[PDB]
Symmetry: D2
């Protein structure tokens, strides 16, 4: 049984990803932590509330950082999902928002880790679907508790972050979440004491595991109440971009909870550039480094670069979202 | 007007003189000491603060903070001017106070103090930072709103010993130690929205400009001679401690002795000691090769040019401190009766 | 179309194969070889070119160029894959051609050749750069206008073995050797206004994707030799001992792209530049994958560079095969 | 000692006063003027030098140099303090000298001059740089060895108006214009091995500390002769824009080159230019506390004399000498 903390900036693919986690057996989302990114934290809170209304779930969700770990944001809000990142769909506003605790998301990660009881029946995982600010902030406050995540075998942290080929979608080199907070990425990747290397679910690997617009049409039944919500959520994205639809965060959640969906990967040293002009936020990957090269430069195999996900397993998981009975 | 201070510190020789100055001034109360990495490691820092509070018998609580920069490995080296422990290698008796202290991270303690703070016309809270800004930045990103509880519209909420005014760097060619230790933290502090008063930047050059003479020092610690020659004759426990604390620094460098952190504490509690300053936009360079940690100052920026760049006057660069008031405050340390 | 090539080079093992390729292809004539620092120092490079031209008894002139980057000390290290002289440590007889060469800096020679050139659609001049771009940048800064004499509206004037398309850096984590050697020079080349055709970027990954097999190599070198095969066996002997299923010969791929444009099976035309200021990414190749006409105009960007993504391996092997079968 | 100067310039208002100072001093001869981009474009610059030489009837040759930085697009803006042409928008008659000038790029002219230079104890050669260092850097990478012909063991071969001593940047927060214009070029000049004497750095703050008064200026232009009339016209926009003191930085640099006794204070140490900072690109980095052992450990040496005080009295007298010149 997996217990997940999902850290998110609450866009359309974040919603599909959360839906995937909540409709999979032997998985329980125990907290949702909101971070700035594609929409502002206040709007994010509203989005999560609307998504949890749909499920009637009593999962607690928390306000996190409104900007980067260090300095003004150097990225722009995309707007691909619409002005609220959620379809501008007219969902009824949620009464869940005001009920939520005041605790900063970072302090909540720590509280959950503190209260966590790892055994072989119950494993805890953090999946990060937005800029890493909340996670970095928690890490520098109490680094030790992060060893409670994962197993020697099961990854404690999976992140939707960076590139494997520096096809940047934010600047020329850097992926959005990474570019949003490069400092936070360094803190996550440099951290000592993960039980398993960070799993890097990067842009290119999600591009190569998309859904077809044809598949989408069938998903949304071109109706039970889940398909209706997905149609409304994706309506702006659909008008703006529609042969394939890339749903990155959902790929990340799939990697976390079905590790067999990883068909190919490369375990090596990875870090984030902080200081370049065109390359701030770039993912730097030691492709050729030997154990002897790394020792010399104080590197180590800290990151598993995911290079191929099983598309078939992904589609089935999406299919499972719309067939879910509580 | 009573001041309640939080002092964030990396626990070197000049940090000790600064805390001594805060603790011996009337209408001032140090309510918490938060320890940060810098010239000594946090563990050693804790031991230093404990030895300093033994001297006073003070029950001020102190807290372990960050062991390294906000982001990445330290890019500075430990100076060693005050000795291997940054505190004289003097054989002070180890303190029993250390083990008694609460486990709380220093950052969470700043937030707790701010949360419990009850500012009024008669009570003002101030944060004086005497080391790398890591703890402060960390507290700031967790709960930025609480920081408006510091200061008044008139009295500065934050005074930092940090940076340069002329980029005479003492860590690399351009950057001062504390700034260079954690440039990212400095950006967080200076870019923060909602300080009641601009950050007061007590920089390297203004502290160099307000030093003590070795001759003054000799009198501070009751060395005399004639007769015959230089020896301490009837030292109080404050002078004895100061003599032991500075003994390595003295052997390494000894006409003037610069005590930067003490100057910053003076600025915080006696604002009339600021003879000259320049209010403008200041930030810290994060990305240069030779200039990482540099203090960048908008010397010629107008209201118009700052508006167009998303700048504002966020920092008061202190350029002259009253040396006479500084010496008197040091004098007041050795004359203190509880 | 008769091609006249200027080959700028740091005179390593793959540089030699590349030059051999140019010199054994019909309707191609190498008219100058300009030497640049890189995997070997300029003096050693001069010696290498001399020994290669001895083999052919070619009277092609060759020139000393920059001994270091456009700006600052080198931030790369000499690889040593081809041996201590970058040329097999093979005991080739030293060349008498070296002392005969003109004193002219390589940069000023590029300018002289461009000045004397009569370009038409029958006779095209092409610069192929196989090393750090120092000499080219330096020439470009001094007389940028003359560089329009290279190429056609159809045929590329400049082809460079440079950069990555995927930031699999072989010098630091992100940057390829030639690019990391001189990132400033790379910006000068890619930012230059007035190329008739975009710069062709023969990057690391595309050359990795078009290698030779060690088996192919054994046949190339006949495994009763001829003089070309003997020289290739000796040139690659250290590389072979150090690394030997596939052998990557990047500079040869670049020369192939310059003289047989039909070997480019796939490419992407967009805006490309080189990072100057990153800590881990100095020398990185920055490629505008998603740039549109609207986004590029706002950013002062334009489609300046053709990123080569697949070369025809079959055409490549045939061209290497043609080296060892050459009769003057 | 007879001095032979090459003056590298971006042709603004203080560049003109500076060149006028060089041309009106005894035992000085300007033998070439090399034009570089900066406050005005090279084409405009050429026009300006031509108008200045018309005034003197001088047959000094001048050359077109770099239109932009050594590497990448300019990251600075044209100031416009001296007006739209950097020269007063004054209506000076256009010069017939421009079309006569050789086509040689300025960089290759520096090399030709150095190649033909004949140093002796009677004749010393100096390069004074009054703009972005692009031309000088470009000449240095092409043929570094020739640059040892400049100077003496005692007399500086290169004097530059460049950088800051206190990082009071007038282009960004940290950097001075010329330095910010071309940081890469500054590294090339400062890192060069083989100068006979350290580079003399005539920086922004020391020139601010040796200005002229507007009152002095009034007396200078006779508030009249052909020299004064020209100076009044050249400074007319600057005067309307800014007018107690008027800073004339390039003139201070020329003064330091030709009257070394005007340097009242300086500090010899290791200096370089930041290439990679966001806010500090173009900053002057100075090793204030470096020692002989500390510098050796880090591959540094004393490559640069940071000028910290110039004799204002000597400066004013030299300006005074401009308007009293008889050929
Ligand atoms: Ca997201
Ligand atoms: Ca301190
Ligand atoms: Ca090569
Ligand atoms: Ca000028």
């Amino acid at each position: 049984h997996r217990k997940l903390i999902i850290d998110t900036d609450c866009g359309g693919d974040d919603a599909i990803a959360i839906m995937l986690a909540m409709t999979q057996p032997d998985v329980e989302v125990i907290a949702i932590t909101v971070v700035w990114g594609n929409v502002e934290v206040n709007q994010g809170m509203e989005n999560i509330g609307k998504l949890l209304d749909l499920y009637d779930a009593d999962i607690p969700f928390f306000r996190g950082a409104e900007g980067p770990l260090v300095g003004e944001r150097e990225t722009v809000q995309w707007g691909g999902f619409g002005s609220d990142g959620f379809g501008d769909a007219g969902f009824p506003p949620s009464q869940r928002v005001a009920l939520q605790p005041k605790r900063h998301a970072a302090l909540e990660i720590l509280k959950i880790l503190e209260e966590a009881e790892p055994s072989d029946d119950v494993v805890y995982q953090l999946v990060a679907l937005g800029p890493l600010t909340n996670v970095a902030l928690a890490l520098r406050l109490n680094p030790d508790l992060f060893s409670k995540l994962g197993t020697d075998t099961i990854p404690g942290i999976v992140i939707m972050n960076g590139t494997s080929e520096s096809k940047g979608n934010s600047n020329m080199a850097a992926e959005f979440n990474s570019h949003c907070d490069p400092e936070a990425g360094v803190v996550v990747l440099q951290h000592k004491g993960w039980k398993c290397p960070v799993q890097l679910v990067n842009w290119e690997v999600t591009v190569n595991s998309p859904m077809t617009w044809g598949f989408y049409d069938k998903l949304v039944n071109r109706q039970n109440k889940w398909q209706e919500f997905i149609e409304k959520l994706f309506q702006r994205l659909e008008a703006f971009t529609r042969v394939t639809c890339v749903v990155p965060d959902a790929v990340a959640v799939l990697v976390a909870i079905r590790p067999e969906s990883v068909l190919d990967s490369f375990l090596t040293y990875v870090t984030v550039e902080l200081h370049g002009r065109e390359t701030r936020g770039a993912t730097c990957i030691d492709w050729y480094g030997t154990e002897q090269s790394m020792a010399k430069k104080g590197r180590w195999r800290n990151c598993n670069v995911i290079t191929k996900v099983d598309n078939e397993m992904f589609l089935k998981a999406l299919r499972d979202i719309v067939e879910y009975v509580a």
